[PDB]
Every structure is written in C-alpha cells, then in structure tokens.
C-alpha cells in the first residue's frame, strides 16, 4: 500500500522520488474519504525537510491553513477529474524548477484530494522536466508503479493527454506554449452509437467550455445550434455544429444525455474530454475509447464498444 509508516509517522504519502512526494489532502474537518491529519503532515515536513519543502495544492475545491506549512504552499486550481490549463501547468513547472534548482536538498510535495489523478498529472510532468523520463507514457507508468497501482498512473484520459502535451511542449516547442491556433467546431461524429443512450444520438447534447464558462451548447435531437444525422449502416451519428464561437486554448467538451440507460461517470456526465486548440493537427481531432473521459474505464466497455470514437471537425478561425 501507498501508506507511509516510518519514523513515527503514519500518512497517505509517497516518495515518488527522493525529492518528489505525492500525497492526499492534508485534512482537518470531518472524517471523509481521505484522511491525512494536517498537524501530522506539517510535522512531517518541519521535521524531515526543515525550511526545504514546497507544497502544491492542486484542488480548485478546497484550501486549508497554509501557515501550518509556514506559508510554503502554491495553489494550482484544477477541478477533480480534470486537467490544469497548459498556461497553469507551465507556471507550475517554472515555479518548481526555480525552487528545486536553488538547493539539491529541496523537495516538492504535490497533493490533490486523493493524490491520484491531478497529482499524477503534475508529478509525471515534473519528472519529464527533470529528465528522469523522456516520454509521458513512461513517466505516467512510473507514477502508477510508485503510488496508484493504476497501469497509466492517473484517473482520466485527459490527464494522460495533458502529460503528453507537456512532453510535446518540451520536445517540439522549447518548453513554451505552441503558437496559438484559433478554431471553430463545425462538426461532431460519434462512432459505435448503438447501445449508447438511445443508440441514435437523439438523447445527446454537447457543451463546449472555455475558461470555466460555457461557450456553446448543442442539443442534437432538437437542432439547437446543430443538425443531427444518424446512419444505421455505419452505426454512427454525424452532427453539424452551428454558431461555434472562436475557440482558443484549453477546451472542455462535455456530452450530456436525457437517457436513463446511460450512466454518468466523472464530471456529472456520460463522457467528456479536454484538448488544446494549438496542439490540434489538421482539421480534426479523433479520440478512441481509451482517450475519452469515462469510456476509458473498463467497467463501461459493454456500453462503449472497442470502436467507440468521437471526432471533432474544425474550421480555421484565425481571421
């Protein structure tokens, strides 16, 4: 188990490396799910790494008394089962890099609620930055082998994607954001639709979210900002998307259903994903089952079949 039971401490805490710690939330309130008493976590860092630690809180949902950590806490606002913006991810990387380069004995402790999904995203990103790994896949697998025992380390497909994005940023874009590409979504295509909701796209709606605001809503059956086509022969739906505003940066696409058959997973919906417009190649992005948030869980694999995919078609909106 990922339980630290050494030197008179008992904490949900992992040394991923000698200087990089992953842990769950340092709690003080009512006993709920995850349970690291903040007094003990603070005692740990003050005893084991005096004046040489920095704590990263990745929860958008909850802060705490940071003076328990002598005010050495940096917050990254990420929603549970979601991803940081690439802007925020790079910000974090730079902060950690400055901190770590200043003293070889400096440590960083990254936490979220469980110290799983969000924590794994930034831990694996840091490990790429520090050069321990050269691919996202290996960094993620390492986090999994050290902490979560999940094969790919993190909780969602978008989390996997975003560590991949960081790898691309380091390798192809000199550690900085790629040149911005502005896009409009003009279509969405979903394959292997039978058995998903009403099996014909009629139950489905799609919400596009940018900077924590809804920027487009499409309701398929109704033709609300769209025009649905169902082809039974190809077991797919094709939906023309109308009136999409110019999209830039990190975009969250959520699919909702009026269907009672289709279960909700993370993010209070059947399936969703994040992508970044600047890392889109060509005029589409296509995601397989394992690349979509919620269908990526094997528990859903008799609903989302092996050929379940979602494709967004884009137009260039640079002008």
* 159, 117 contact by CB (below 8 A): yes
Q: How was this structure determined?
A: X-ray
Per DSSP, 44 falls in state H
Ordered domains of the chain (ranges, CATH): 1-176 (3.90.190.10), 177-319 (2.60.40.1110)
* 284, 311 contact by CB (below 8 A): yes
Phi/psi of residue 170, nearest 5 degrees: -65, -40
User: In whole angstroms, what is the distance from residue 164 CA to residue 151 CA?
Assistant: 16
Q: Are strands 284-288 and 309-316 parallel, antiparallel or unpaired?
A: antiparallel
User: In whole angstroms, what is the distance from residue 37 CA to residue 65 CA?
Assistant: 12
Tell which residue, 27, 26, 67, 72, has the closest CA to residue 49.
72
Phi-psi region of 271 (alpha: psi -120 to 50; beta: other; left: phi over 0): beta
> What is the resolution of the experimental data for this entry, in Å?
1.7
Cβ within 8 Å of residue 220, ≥6 positions away: 201, 202, 203, 204, 205, 206, 226, 228, 237, 239
Task: Kindly tell me the burial class for residue 7, based on how many C-beta atoms sit within 10 Å of its own C-beta (0-12, 13-18, 19 or more).
Answer: exposed
Phi-psi region of 215 (alpha: psi -120 to 50; beta: other; left: phi over 0): alpha
Task: Kindly tell me the burial class for residue 148, based on how many C-beta atoms sit within 10 Å of its own C-beta (0-12, 13-18, 19 or more).
Answer: buried
């Amino acid at each position: 188990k990922r339980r630290y039971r050494k030197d008179g401490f008992d904490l949900d805490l992992t040394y991923v490396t000698d200087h990089v710690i992953a842990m769950s939330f340092p709690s003080s309130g009512r006993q709920s799910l995850f349970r690291n008493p903040i007094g003990e976590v603070s005692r740990f860092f003050k005893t084991k790494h005096p004046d040489k630690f920095r704590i990263y809180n990745l929860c958008s949902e909850r802060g705490y008394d940071e003076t328990k950590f002598d005010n050495h806490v940096y917050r990254v606002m990420i929603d549970d089962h979601n991803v940081p913006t690439l802007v925020d991810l790079l910000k974090f990387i730079d902060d950690a890099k400055v901190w770590m380069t200043s003293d070889p004995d400096h440590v960083i402790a990254i936490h979220s609620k469980g110290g799983k999904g969000r924590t794994g995203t930034l831990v694996s990103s840091w490990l790429l930055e520090d050069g321990k790994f050269d691919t996202a896949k290996e960094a993620l697998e390492y986090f999994g082998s050290r902490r979560t025992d999940v094969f790919q380390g993190v909780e969602t497909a978008s989390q996997i994607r975003y560590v991949g994005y960081f790898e691309k940023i380091k390798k192809n874009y000199g550690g900085q954001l790629p040149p911005m590409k502005k896009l409009k979504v003009t279509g969405v295509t979903i394959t292997a639709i039978q058995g998903v909701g009403r099996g014909n796209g009629s139950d489905l709606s799609m919400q596009i979210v940018s900077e924590r605001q809804e920027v487009l809503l499409c309701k398929f059956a109704e033709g609300y900002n769209c025009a649905l086509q169902y082809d039974a022969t190809d077991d797919c739906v094709t939906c023309e998307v109308k009136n999409c505003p110019v999209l830039a940066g990190d975009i969250k696409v959520r699919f909702m259903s009026t269907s009672k058959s289709l279960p909700r997973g993370y993010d209070n919906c059947p399936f969703y994903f994040w992508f970044n417009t600047s890392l889109v190649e060509g005029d589409h992005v296509t995601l397989k089952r394992e690349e979509i948030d919620n269908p990526h869980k094997k528990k859903t694999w008799k609903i989302y079949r092996d050929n379940f995919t979602v494709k967004l078609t884009f137009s260039d909106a640079e002008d």
